[PDB]
Amino acid sequence: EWTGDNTNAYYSDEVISELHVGQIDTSPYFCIKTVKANGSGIPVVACAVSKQSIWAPSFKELLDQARYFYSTGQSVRIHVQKNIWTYPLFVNTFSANALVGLSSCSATQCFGPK
Amino acid sequence: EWTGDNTNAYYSDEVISELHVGQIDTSPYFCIKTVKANGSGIPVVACAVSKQSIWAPSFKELLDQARYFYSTGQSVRIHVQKNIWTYPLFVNTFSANALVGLSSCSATQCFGPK
Amino acid sequence: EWTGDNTNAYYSDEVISELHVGQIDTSPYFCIKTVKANGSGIPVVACAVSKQSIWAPSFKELLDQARYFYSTGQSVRIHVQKNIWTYPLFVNTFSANALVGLSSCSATQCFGPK
Amino acid sequence: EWTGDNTNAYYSDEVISELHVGQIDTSPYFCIKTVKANGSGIPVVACAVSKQSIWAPSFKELLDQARYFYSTGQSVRIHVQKNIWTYPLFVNTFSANALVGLSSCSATQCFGPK
Amino acid sequence: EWTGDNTNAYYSDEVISELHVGQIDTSPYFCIKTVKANGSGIPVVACAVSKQSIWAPSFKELLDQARYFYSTGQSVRIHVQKNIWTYPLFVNTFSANALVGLSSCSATQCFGPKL
Numbered sequence: 423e424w425t426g427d428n429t430n431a432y433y434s435d436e437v438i439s440e441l442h443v444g445q446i447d448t449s450p451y452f453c454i455k456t457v458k459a460n461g462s463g464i465p466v467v468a469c470a471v472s473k474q475s476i477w478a479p480s481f482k483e484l485l486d487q488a489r490y491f492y493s494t495g496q497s498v499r500i501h502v503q504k505n506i507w508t509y510p511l512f513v514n515t516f517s518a519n520a521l522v523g524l525s526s527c528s529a530t531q532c533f534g535p536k
Numbered sequence: 537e538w539t540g541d542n543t544n545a546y547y548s549d550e551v552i553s554e555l556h557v558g559q560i561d562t563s564p565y566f567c568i569k570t571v572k573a574n575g576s577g578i579p580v581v582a583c584a585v586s587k588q589s590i591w592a593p594s595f596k597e598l599l600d601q602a603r604y605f606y607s608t609g610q611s612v613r614i615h616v617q618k619n620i621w622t623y624p625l626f627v628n629t630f631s632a633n634a635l636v637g638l639s640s641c642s643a644t645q646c647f648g649p650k
Numbered sequence: 651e652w653t654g655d656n657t658n659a660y661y662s663d664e665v666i667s668e669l670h671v672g673q674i675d676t677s678p679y680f681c682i683k684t685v686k687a688n689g690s691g692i693p694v695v696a697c698a699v700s701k702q703s704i705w706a707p708s709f710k711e712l713l714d715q716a717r718y719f720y721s722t723g724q725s726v727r728i729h730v731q732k733n734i735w736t737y738p739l740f741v742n743t744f745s746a747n748a749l750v751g752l753s754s755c756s757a758t759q760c761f762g763p764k
Numbered sequence: 765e766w767t768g769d770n771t772n773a774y775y776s777d778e779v780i781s782e783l784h785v786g787q788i789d790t791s792p793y794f795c796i797k798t799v800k801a802n803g804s805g806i807p808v809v810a811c812a813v814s815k816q817s818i819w820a821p822s823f824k825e826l827l828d829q830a831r832y833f834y835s836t837g838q839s840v841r842i843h844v845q846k847n848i849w850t851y852p853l854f855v856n857t858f859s860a861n862a863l864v865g866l867s868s869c870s871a872t873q874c875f876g877p878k
Numbered sequence: 879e880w881t882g883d884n885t886n887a888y889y890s891d892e893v894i895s896e897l898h899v900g901q902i903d904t905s906p907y908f909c910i911k912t913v914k915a916n917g918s919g920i921p922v923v924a925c926a927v928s929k930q931s932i933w934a935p936s937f938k939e940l941l942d943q944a945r946y947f948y949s950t951g952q953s954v955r956i957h958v959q960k961n962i963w964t965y966p967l968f969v970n971t972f973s974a975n976a977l978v979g980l981s982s983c984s985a986t987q988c989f990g991p992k993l
Contacts, residue, residue, distance in 0.1 A: 423787070423788070423789065424786070424787070424789070424853070424854065425786030425788065426786070426854065426857060439642070440639075440640045440647030441601075441640050441647070442637070442638070442639040442640065442647050442648045443597050443601040443637060443638050443639075444538070444540070444615065444637035444638075444639075444648070445537070445538070445591055445593060445594040445597075445637070446537070446539070447537065447538070448537075448590075448593050449593065450593055450596075450598075452601075455647050472597075476790075477787055479787060479790050479791065479792055479814075480785070480786070480787040480792040483785050483792040483794070484785065486831075487783075487785045489600075490831065490835070509538075511538075511540065512538065512540070515540055515648075522786065522787060523784070523785060523786035524784065524786075525782075525783075525784040526782045526783050526784065528782065533782035533783070533784050533795070533797050534784045534857065535853070535857045536857075553756065553757070554756060554757065554761030555715075555761070556752070556753040556754065556762045557708070557711050557712065557752055558654070558708070558750065558751035558752075559651070559652070559653055559704075559705055559707065559708040559750065560651070560652040560653065560654075561651065562651075562704065562707055563707065564711045566711070567761070586707070603718065623652070625652075625654060625763070626652065629654060629762065629763045667984070668981075668982045668983075668984070668989035669982050670980070670981040670982065670989050670990045671979060671980050672880070672882070672936070672978065672979035672980075673880070673881055673933055673935060673936040673939075673978060673979070674879070674880040674881065675879065675880070676879075677935065678935055678939040680939070681989070683989050700935075700939075713939070717946065721946075737880065739880070739882060739991070740882065743882055743990070743991045743992075765902070765903065765904075766900070766902045766903070766965070767900030767901055767902065768900070768967060768968070768971055818904075819901055821901060821904055821905065821906055822899075822900070824906075825899050825906040825908070825928075825941070826906075829899040829908075832945065832949075836949075864901060865899060865900035865901070866899050867896075867898040868896045868897050869896075870895075875896030875897070875898050875909070875911050876898045876900070877971045878971075
């Protein structure tokens with residue numbers, strides 16, 4: 423598995439606009455909301471859940487990095503794997519996307535897989 | 537269990553105004569105090585205790601997130617479970633509320649369950 | 651045991667003026683110096699020793715919180731247990747006080763036990 | 765082995781211009797892009813993979829230090845070992861350089877091996 | 879052993895002017911360069927190596943603290959044990975000093991062991 427696998431989805435030139443932390447079924451988790459920096463498009467929602475999914479090893483790295491990029495409001499590419507979380511009420515509040523990666527974006531390019 | 541369960545309570549458009557750390561019965565703990573950004577209402581007090589209650593696994597995550605929102609002073613939704621802590625001098629100093637989640641808010645919406 | 655036990659001492663409306671990190675007998679330790687915000691009185695010195703005493707589990711939490719309040723210079727309540735540390739030159743350089751809690755005091759009262 | 769070994773390469777007076785975090789084969793990883801502070805030359809790309817290569821033990825230290833130097837925009841010397849990473853798609857997006865060390869610089873010199 | 883043992887050395891009112899992170903012989907390490915705030919004397923270099931020397935338990939504590947003091951530029955007292963590291967090339971680039979403690983200073987006194 424890799425953040426960059428073409429079975430994962432990504433969204434470029436986004437800003438993390440909201441951050442949430444909680445717990446589900448013994449797992450601390452966090453979710454982020456991101457919107458296009460130019461103000462267009464539809465928001466993206468993705469979550470990371472501690473000890474849950476193949477992406478569990480990266481939970482702390484992603485939490486720390488989402489925190490940083492959130493605090494600067496800088497433009498980023500968000501990488502997700504769709505249809506991972508299955509609790510329907512959780513999915514309805516947030517989404518089923520597992521967050522799998524984060525890349526800074528310049529005015530010209532995003533530093534990550536495409 | 538989930539932050540979003542309707543057996544938990546929540547308060548929106550609050551700011552973390554005080555923060556305390558300590559230890560009880562060999563467990564690190566922290567408490568926060570939040571007030572409405574607009575000055576109305578009464579304060580919310582909630583505590584997390586590192587090896588107590590079902591919310592134990594997210595102690596560190598909530599401590600780090602509470603520090604972040606405290607240092608920025610931004611408006612948040614605080615999620616609590618009432619009537620958890622039982623030590624009377626502790627409850628009277630702070631409250632019986634366990635802290636179970638923190639959601640950032642924009643001017644119009646809070647990014648978390650409701 | 652609890653930060654708020656009446657066998658412990660506390661000093662309100664202080665600021666953290668100095669911070670030291672070191673090691674003794676294979677244990678990381680830190681100490682802080684605090685003074686009344688208003689200049690009155692004498693300083694308080696207290697240390698946490700990572701591997702020693704019932705307060706050991708709270709070492710990291712206390713160090714992280716000591717660092718943050720040190721960096722802001724905001725008013726705090728410092729909570730200590732007196733006469734616990736024993737190495738004579740250590741006590742004489744610093745003190746025999748264990749640091750057992752830190753409360754913010756940005757308001758009328760400090761947010762912690764008294 | 766050592767960051768300063770003959771058989772590693774280094775590039776001085778660089779600024780960390782991009783940062784990416786992800787996961788590959790159960791291992792969190794991060795990559796950075798650096799460019800010369802004075803605008804000259806060609807960008808350097810280097811990655812660290814938490815469970816892989818002889819540099820694995822330093823993953824957390826390098827991640828934290830890369831993050832700090834990124835957040836400050838300050839001039840650094842970057843040390844890499846060439847031809848480490850093998851997954852072709854990964855190398856194409858980023859590079860095969862393993863990050864093995866970061867050194868801060870002043871105007872004239874960098875504090876690290878030469 | 880103790881940071882404050884009189885067999886250790888210390889340098890008061892120093893500014894942490896450079897910082898380096900790397901790896902050696904399986905261990906993450908970091909080194910710092912300090913200079914007297916008043917401009918006098920010679921720079922001090924000291925290093926901490928994860929899981930090496932008696933001071934290994936304090937590696938993360940000292941790294942975090944060295945980062946903080948490095949980022950502020952404030953005046954500090956640096957405590958070292960001399961002649962600890964033996965890698966020849968490593969010592970040539972940096973020094974043999976193990977970092978064993980850091981103390982903040984006011985303009986008139988450092989909050990740490992002396993003598």
